Symmetry: D2
Subunit: 295 residues, 4 copies
């Protein structure tokens, strides 16, 4: 037998960081969950009990906090690139660092219509994430994303004209509910290393903002022919607004809301145009995926 692939490190490292402006008293907080997995000349730790090649996961944990202490933790694309670069530069035998960061929301509170200098609220479990793969001799590959953005529209969603055969029971509809949890990923052009990442720092926050804004506006305004058609429109627009992105990926569940026929009860009408009460379905759910690139 032989090791064909191997990576190891520390997962689920919770990190908080605060910035305090000594002049204004305004404080700003950041919270994330970090995973760092390393690859390199480490096969003998698996095959020969040779731990000398292992950078202990406990040490990787320490390194995550130390790096957050000495560097900005925002935008996460930059932090992840600095962290990953550290491992491949520090250890000669480590050749790739895989950094995943989940950013948690801490939005400044408004109290009496004025932003508070040091109080925050978790407004939704929506996350901003990055996957930063730092590979020696192959630069830095970054995938940025937003996830857990849960939305619903109560009309202006349709689904008709689909294939009908002996397995089909679904009725065509010209007016249905559409609800999903948005998982959207934009994949950046390869970067040659940390300097190139630094040269584009402002584009990371800007592109995340565009992705979110396009997602929400398209969802709200598209009289949707299907999840497929709507998600494609989102991807197209994001690609047109940031030329440094190569592809856009969407992963969308169709979280179904079923009509409830109540005509068995005193002839109550609750279907079609009379539909007011629906049953949200926890499972199963449609799952619709696509990766969109440049023609």
């Amino acid at each position: 037998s032989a090791v064909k692939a191997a990576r190891y490190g520390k997962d689920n490292v919770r990190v908080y960081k605060v910035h305090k402006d000594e002049k204004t008293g305004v404080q700003t907080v950041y919270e994330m969950t970090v995973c760092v997995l390393l690859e390199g000349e480490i096969e003998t730790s698996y095959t020969k009990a040779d731990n000398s090649v292992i950078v202990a996961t406990d040490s990787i944990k320490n390194t995550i906090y130390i790096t957050a202490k000495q560097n900005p933790v925002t935008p996460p694309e930059l932090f992840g690139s600095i962290l990953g670069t550290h491992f491949i530069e520090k250890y000669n035998h480590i050749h790739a660092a895989h950094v995943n960061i989940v950013c948690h929301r801490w939005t400044r509170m408004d109290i009496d219509g004025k932003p508070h200098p040091h109080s925050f609220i978790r407004d939704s479990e929506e996350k901003r994430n990055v996957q930063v793969d730092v590979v020696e001799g192959k630069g830095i590959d970054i995938k940025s994303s937003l996830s857990g953005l849960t939305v619903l529209k109560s009309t202006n969603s349709q689904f008709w004209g689909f294939l009908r055969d002996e397995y089909t029971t679904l009725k065509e509809t010209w007016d249905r509910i559409l609800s999903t949890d948005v998982d959207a990923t934009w994949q950046w052009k390869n970067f040659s290393g940390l300097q190139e990442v630094r040269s584009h720092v402002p584009k990371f926050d800007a592109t995340w903002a565009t992705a979110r804004e396009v997602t929400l506006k398209t969802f709200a305004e598209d009289n949707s022919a299907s999840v497929q058609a709507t998600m494609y429109k989102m991807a197209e627009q994001i690609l047109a607004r940031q030329q440094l992105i190569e592809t856009v990926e969407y992963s969308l569940p169709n979280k179904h809301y079923f009509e409830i026929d109540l005509s068995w009860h005193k002839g109550l009408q609750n279907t079609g145009k009379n539909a007011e009460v629906f049953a949200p379905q926890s499972d199963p759910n449609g799952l619709i995926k696509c990766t969109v690139g440049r023609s």
Copy 2:
């Protein structure tokens, strides 16, 4: 043996309802999870296999949808009272109906600075809940609450002067992080029945708004001596602003953020005044409770 207590029904009933304004095109959505448990002369279903006394849980489920179809689902205090009242009035042998409602957030989207007529976003897993106990001959007892309101302040929290003995290792602090998940309950004066509940309908939304506003403002502005002291201030203010409430209950975890001593590493200073990077602790957590009433 004998039945000392018994209640049964349907839990986890997901319900959506939409309101459509035919004139303006504006739609409004409501989503909840409902539990209804009944008590009454039902002991023989347990002791003698006598199912004739059982209103099937499947039927309770149907009744929840039918009631949502024929009545407003807001405020949840009203809906729960109508639902509970139905069971005790409809079935002679049913003497209590216990209705729990969890309201899910569907906040209208703003697109290009203008509210959208039929698109919504789940802004946080914060819930608005009610527990409505409808008991024949004993009126309606309502407990309203907000839960899952997750907040953090990065300073203006203290904890010193606590008891110190041979079990104590915690250092006193004059500046720490405070984060919690707010669970706040206001208990209403007993109502004699559904008419009395109806007579106070506007106070339900108003009191929920006050509870939330007081929670947030007190959390942000109190230079906290402890969780205990801060939560008490919240309770006091809510009681002073709604005389129909008898008590206010708070349940607050202290979700700890620990300093990370990094001086072992190149003498890095990250404690006390130099503290920037912290380790959020998933567990354990302090848990602080109190019920506040009128003197």
Copy 3:
């Protein structure tokens, strides 16, 4: 305003303990999650920022580990009683200690048909729990339970003869699936203090074993007329086998499995006697409760 009730302490304290037999090499592990909440003359911590009355939750945490170090952690009824007793005896102003313990399963592995001296497997998320309320001048009240015991029977469950009216759509059935997650609680006679608890130590493990054995055997062998009827039989038997228990409580969801009519597809028969494929329903679910005592 005034404090009407208050309790505080530390929740979610994970604890592991190992016992090593120096003679045989056999090791035995215990793992639990502990919550300790205290009551007493502590109202001024809430109303006057008087932290001198507070035993810090961090100290309660330390005390949990120290007590596990100096005392057996099994049976959990005993450990919880020792822990709770400590707080009310150690602190004059603390008058009640509320101890909740969740015991996690670590079952010894069998390797090549022989029990292994120090390797364990988590065989199910089924828990064994206790709630031990130690109240000064009122002894020790213990509620023991098993929870998360998930079971299914594929026949010998029925439900017919229930009430039918204009809200009823459920068909009567003489053969259905029954699945539930068992939550069973036995409430012990009040104990005057720790000595009395100690005098009954062997009965705690024995009664837990009986409760589980009765639950499983009754579930498997009862041709069930309803959840209500079956759970009552379980409670009766447990009460008859341990006279130190006063009441038995069951909390059982009916986790529904629905038939799937496939006759629309090539006349496939999958209902009634031909039912082979079913759709498990995640929600909603029936919820059936009862507390059984002695006549």
Copy 4:
């Protein structure tokens, strides 16, 4: 813009199936959660609102139940292959079917030392899974796995000799706790189609059994030099016992149990040889991965 990749279908389809022996009265149950995602000439559903190319996800759901009705659902490798094959053979424009199956445990109960004909218990959340990719012109690729197998050993785990530098604080140890959640995957030689899968049916259950048995025995008996070294031994043995497997993948968290120094309290000794009480750490955790193939 252009579609670079696309797949869609139904996720989280819960399925139960029962087998009844008319002669013996013995019944056997199977429960799973199924996902089916399709690829093919479907890009116009995304780019041109052309739903004619869409096999509705609702129809995919129906097809999953119909296929379970007409075919054995065990072993899951076979069921997934039959299901995936159906879609690519039935629809000319569908060229790949991706089938994921999670099998849930329903182990027959033993009552009074005798196996019960129709009562089952969920003994752990451990799952048996398959990923079956059916691609037209490229056969069937199957990955089988076990997951959520949670284990602990209280000694005979070591970790010393790892790299030590300015980022290192971890002490070397010659006796520690090792606990993990086993995720083990065996990847089968490509199969040319469903007939070839059928020709190996008995090997699927046998290889799952071997994987589990090897996992448990190696975990229990290896005086472990590291997670890396131990997992490699498992992979090697599985590969040596089934020549139709090409690679074995392990994904193992190191779920840390920390010593608790209590010497600050009355000089209590709870470290090293005196270590009895430990603090399980929920996060962070080491994460160790490797894919092992044939040399």
